[PDB]
Design a protein around this ligand. Structure first.
Ligand SMILES: N[C@@H](CCC(=O)O)C(=O)O
Length: 498
């Protein structure tokens, strides 16, 4: 909700004043009024650039503005990549080069000034809206541009389509001011939504496998979406308290999304990755809503909300304990999996036994279990005869909670030390007590490293030596160390009483 410009300031930011002062007037010869719509290509840039190459790129940008302005609107469905090709050229240049951003905006203000055709003016406003959704003008133009938007919205004799685009452009500029910069050029899907002044649809998978459909905009961060999912799911409304976040998943490989990262930036990365493929492998992308942080901040305990969060965590933990990077203990896996089968299908029958091969894989037992321990699984399952769904679930929850990896943030790591007393393949299990070094081959905790000793990721051990931990997701490890350290700092502040 922060205003870029107050209504009282509109009259103090006339574009004509900005243009008279900053336009490259000496290098712009031409018969046509340089300040307003023209059909022909500009001979030089509208603004002054120090690099002659950027002046050239600015002239090229104007041709693409014309190309988009003049394109058949109904080509957008036929070949969307071709329709958005001039848009992506413009947005790529502007996002990469900050000194070229004001030039882009001025070209769009110019082409929407005294435009004689409403259909062409509608296209320029689509372009303004795509630009606003990508990068803002610099501080030297942003208030003149915000005045131009407000004048268009409140005064200008323009179409409803232009007023809607101008309103949505002002809103997204405000949204970005609050949420910070983006890193990627919008995908075709995002551009399609922006063009029509509508939200972006994203599908989030919960830990229980269920799907939640969500509407976001270009500026939507992981934190905002995590708070929205939390609130909708009837959990504690603040993801900073409940510890959940949205992660990115590609072919089962999970990557952390930072709290200020834009979900639409993950979509552009996906769009590129799914195209660069050109049919060689599967391209299974998912957003997943999972518990990342484990704070012992359960006070007025809203038990209802807490129970919803724990139910999601039990699915996540059970699935992590069926993953060989974390757990290789078959007797433990048989114990939790047989109770889950008892909870879902009740007492053993020979029909359940015939159904289990293939079907139960990754659900009630692992690959190693169906392989070498099917009768041991069945024998354990038969021992649960007479347990109600409630009692089998109670027993499964106790077994999950008793595991050393329960209520820990899990990180798969490797080390190259020829002297350190840890297996080369280890797990960092981060919780409120420390950075725990865990051996998934033996199911044993090896060491609890203090957050206080902390300044690939270099971890300072008790003996003051350094463990250089290599991982596929450094951002996750770094953020976990920072979040638990901040939580411990906040608890020390609350404990101090003058
Ligand atoms: N602050 C803007 C515009 C100043 C004006 O319009 O006087 C610039 O110098 O880039």
């Amino acid at each position: 909700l922060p205003q870029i410009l107050n209504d009282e300031e509109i009259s103090l930011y006339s574009f004509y004043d900005y243009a008279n002062k900053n336009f490259n007037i000496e290098k712009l010869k031409q018969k046509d009024d340089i300040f307003s719509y023209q059909e022909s290509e500009i001979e030089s840039s509208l603004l002054v650039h120090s690099d002659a190459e950027q002046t050239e790129v600015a002239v090229e940008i104007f041709s693409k503005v014309l190309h988009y302005m003049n394109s058949n609107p109904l080509v957008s469905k036929k070949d969307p990549a071709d329709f958005y090709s001039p848009v992506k050229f413009i947005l790529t240049k502007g996002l990469a080069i900050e000194s070229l951003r004001d030039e882009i905006y001025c070209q769009l203000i110019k082409q929407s000034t005294s435009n004689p055709i409403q259909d062409l003016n509608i296209r320029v406003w689509e372009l303004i809206h795509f630009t606003c959704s990508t990068f803002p003008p610099t501080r030297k133009l942003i208030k003149y541009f915000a005045a131009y938007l407000k004048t268009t919205i409140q005064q200008s004799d323009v179409s409803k389509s232009v007023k809607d685009s101008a309103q949505a452009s002002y809103f997204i500029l405000q949204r970005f001011t609050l949420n910070g910069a983006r890193k990627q050029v919008p995908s075709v899907t995002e551009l399609e939504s922006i063009k029509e002044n509508r939200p972006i649809f994203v599908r989030i998978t919960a830990t229980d496998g269920s799907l939640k459909g969500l509407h976001i905009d270009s500026a939507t961060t992981c934190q905002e979406s995590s708070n929205d999912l939390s609130q909708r799911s009837r959990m504690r409304v603040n993801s900073k308290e409940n510890g959940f976040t949205i992660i990115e998943s590609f072919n089962g490989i999970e990557r952390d999304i930072a709290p200020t990262d834009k979900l639409c930036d993950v979509l552009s990365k996906v769009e590129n990755l799914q195209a660069t493929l050109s049919s060689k492998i599967q391209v299974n992308f998912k957003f997943v809503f999972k518990k990342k942080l484990f704070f012992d901040n359960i006070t007025n305990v809203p038990t209802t909300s807490i129970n919803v969060e724990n139910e999601f965590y039990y699915h996540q933990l059970f699935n992590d304990l069926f993953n060989s990077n974390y757990c290789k203990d078959q007797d433990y896996q048989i114990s939790i999996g047989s109770l889950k089968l008892q909870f879902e299908s009740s007492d053993y029958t020979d029909e359940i036994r015939a159904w289990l091969p293939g079907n139960g894989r990754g659900k009630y037992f692992t690959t190693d279990i169906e392989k070498n321990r099917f009768d041991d699984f069945i024998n354990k399952y038969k021992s649960h005869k007479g347990l109600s769904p409630e009692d089998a679930k109670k027993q499964m929850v106790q077994l999950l909670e008793k595991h050393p990896l329960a209520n820990c943030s899990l990180v798969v790591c490797e080390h190259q030390s020829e002297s350190l007393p840890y297996p080369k393949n280890f797990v960092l299990a981060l919780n409120v007590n420390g950075i725990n070094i865990y051996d998934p081959a033996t199911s044993k905790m090896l060491e609890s490293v203090k957050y206080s000793n902390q300044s690939s990721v270099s971890i300072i051990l008790e003996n003051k030596s350094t463990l250089q931990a290599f991982t596929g997701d450094v951002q996750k490890l770094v953020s976990l160390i920072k979040e638990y350290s901040l939580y411990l700092r906040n608890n020390a502040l609350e404990h101090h009483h003058h």
